[PDB]
């Protein structure tokens, strides 16, 4: 079915520009619309969409309505201009999901066998690659609950297209690209420890909270399982590198050797040729 989704900045903006539409008139809830997907393969892609007036009451927390006269005839519009573009699901800006979201997908399953919902974010904050994606399946449960319909997270990734980077990538103009090979990889390293070890502390504090409160989630078992896959090397005191010690510097063996060999001859190219051309102009002029 649906494994991963591809969200373009163009269709994501179609949720963002509608945040100006109903944001000025208010009032409650969020921006919600129906998603037009482009499915060429198991990997899902999204090009365009259409935003529909939508509201969700608080009291009355289970009340939701799409406008389906907007959904029907406007489909024949986008279908007439683009035959490949069709509705794969819906979307909204979240930020989180209330329990009522179970009924939005099951209603529109007449349009698509499986409707994928995309939670987006109009204001970028944290922690990383934004928005979100969910898929609607039924896993029931191990405890014996009646059949449980819970949306499972779908990994979301941004993607590009020809001719769409004209105006999009133009307006920024302030970015330095990249530079690959010097700063590009090292800034990630400073962040790879930051973003790597912050979720380490956020989860290890919530995993300690388990014993305290919030149990379940037990989880189970996914938590410790892949944590023990992380445990191929801990790495703890001290590094257990006795076999990887001589191999540590042995990987730095040729990297330092070439860096010593290149800088020697690069100098011979830089130093000699500079002295030659310099004294040819300098002393022959005066």
């Amino acid at each position: 079915a649906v494994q991963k989704v591809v969200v373009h900045p163009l269709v994501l903006l179609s949720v963002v520009d509608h945040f100006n539409r109903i944001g000025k008139v208010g009032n409650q809830k969020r921006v919600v619309g129906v998603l037009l997907g482009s499915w060429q393969k198991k990997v899902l892609d999204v090009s365009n969409s259409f935003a529909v007036p939508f509201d969700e009451d608080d009291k009355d927390d289970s009340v939701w309505f799409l406008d389906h006269d907007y959904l029907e005839n406007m489909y024949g519009m986008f279908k007439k201009v683009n035959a490949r573009e069709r509705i794969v699901g819906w979307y909204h800006t979240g930020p989180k999901l209330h329990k009522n979201d179970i009924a939005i997908n099951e209603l529109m399953k007449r349009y698509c066998p499986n409707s994928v919902l995309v939670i987006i974010d109009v204001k970028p904050k944290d922690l990383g690659l934004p928005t979100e994606a969910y898929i609607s399946v039924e896993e029931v449960h191990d405890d014996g609950t009646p059949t449980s319909k819970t949306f499972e997270h779908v990994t979301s990734e941004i993607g590009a297209e020809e001719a769409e980077e004209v105006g999009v990538e133009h307006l920024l103009r302030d970015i330095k690209d990249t530079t690959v090979g010097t700063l590009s990889q090292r800034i990630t390293n400073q962040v790879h420890g930051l973003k790597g070890l912050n979720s380490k502390l956020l989860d290890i504090r919530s995993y300690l909270e388990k014993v305290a409160t919030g149990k379940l989630p037990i989880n189970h078992q996914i938590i410790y399982q892949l944590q023990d896959v992380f445990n191929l090397l801990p790495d703890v005191s001290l590094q257990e590198f006795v076999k990887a010690f001589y191999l540590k510097t042995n990987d730095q063996m040729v990297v330092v050797y070439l860096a010593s060999l290149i800088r020697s001859v690069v100098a011979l190219h830089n130093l000699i040729n500079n002295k030659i051309a310099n004294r040819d102009a300098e002393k022959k002029e005066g």
């Binding site: 900045p9 903006l13 179609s14 963002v16 520009d17 100006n20 539409r21 944001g23 090009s47 365009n48 935003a51 007036p53 005839n73 406007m74 519009m77 201009v81 683009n82 109009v122 970028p124 990383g128 690659l129 934004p130 990734e157 941004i158 020809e162 001719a163 769409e164 980077e165 004209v166 105006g167 999009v168 990538e169 133009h170 307006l171 920024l172 970015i175 090979g181 010097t182 990889q185 090292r186 990630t188 390293n189 962040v191 420890g193 973003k195 590094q239 990987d251 730095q252 040729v254 990297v255 070439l258 060999l261 290149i262 800088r263 001859v265 690069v266 190219h269 000699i272 040729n273 030659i276």
Partner: protein, 278 residues
């Protein structure tokens, strides 16, 4: 009577369907419609752009369905903003995006409907990322040849847009037409996330993910050694000697600075041992 140079405020949402709907018609030319509000004579804004059915038999003035707009405006009422129509646009991917013979026939028809009806063209081909490309024009009336034929006041917004002058046939259409200025009213809220969504997705996906060892340096040493002798024969070729050969010639680049950065790639990637671990 009084005519002042117009300034076009385009929304980042209206910029989407210009290139996107134009990409769907590639290679063939499409016909769209511009949506916006007329503030005054010297400024104009396009707040929305929508897609219209592409013509596989060629663009015509009847390609725009009036019941398509009448059903669209009604759907814009239940949508947040029901703004009145303004003008039209069309893609021209196959060439340098100039107004064709059909574009002038649909001018007097659209300029009768709406006052301005700015003619807007767009092309995918001229660039990819860092150029505005697109196009825009506005019909100056040929009946005005009796009157003064050189609008507009506040000139160089035209005059500067009259640069580069874009070859000949394009500005050959400057007879009976005059282009219009396109500036971006700030969407920067969306434009700030446009940079954040683009670069974060391009930074190692987590920034973590991405962060032929000696052999890649054995393949590099062929570029770091076997390339040296073909590079270091040139200073012996600079020795004539002396001097019958035409000079100067500079062979210093680009291999020297490439092997420099080649070590910059290999040194900081080897620092991943010291960086990631401890």
């Amino acid at each position: 009577a009084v005519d002042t140079a117009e300034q076009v405020y385009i929304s980042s949402l209206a910029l989407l369907k210009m290139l996107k709907h134009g990409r769907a018609g590639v290679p063939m030319e499409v016909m769209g419609l511009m949506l916006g509000e007329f503030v005054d004579d010297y400024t104009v804004r396009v707040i929305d752009v929508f897609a219209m059915p592409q013509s596989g038999t060629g663009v015509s003035v009847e390609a725009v369905d009036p019941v398509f707009q009448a059903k669209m405006l009604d759907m814009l009422k239940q949508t947040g903003r029901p703004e009145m129509v303004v003008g039209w646009y069309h893609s021209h991917p196959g060439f340098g995006c100039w107004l064709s013979g059909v574009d002038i026939n649909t001018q007097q028809s659209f300029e009768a409907l709406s006052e301005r009806a700015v003619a807007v063209v767009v092309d995918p081909i001229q660039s990819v990322k860092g150029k505005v490309v697109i196009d825009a024009f506005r019909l100056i009336n040929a009946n005005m040849m009796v009157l003064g034929h050189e609008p507009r006041q506040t000139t160089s917004n035209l005059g500067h847009l009259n640069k580069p002058s874009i070859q000949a046939l394009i500005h050959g259409l400057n007879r009976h037409y005059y282009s219009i200025t396109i500036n971006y009213r700030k969407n920067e809220l969306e434009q700030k996330m446009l940079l954040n969504l683009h670069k974060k997705s391009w930074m190692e996906g987590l920034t973590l993910q991405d962060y032929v060892v000696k052999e890649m340096l054995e393949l590099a040493k062929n570029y770091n050694k076997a390339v040296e002798e073909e590079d270091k024969m040139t200073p012996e070729q600079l020795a004539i000697k002396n001097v019958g050969k035409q000079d100067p010639k500079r062979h210093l680049e680009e291999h020297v600075d490439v092997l420099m950065t080649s070590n910059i790639v290999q040194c900081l990637a080897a620092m991943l041992d010291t960086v990631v671990f401890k």
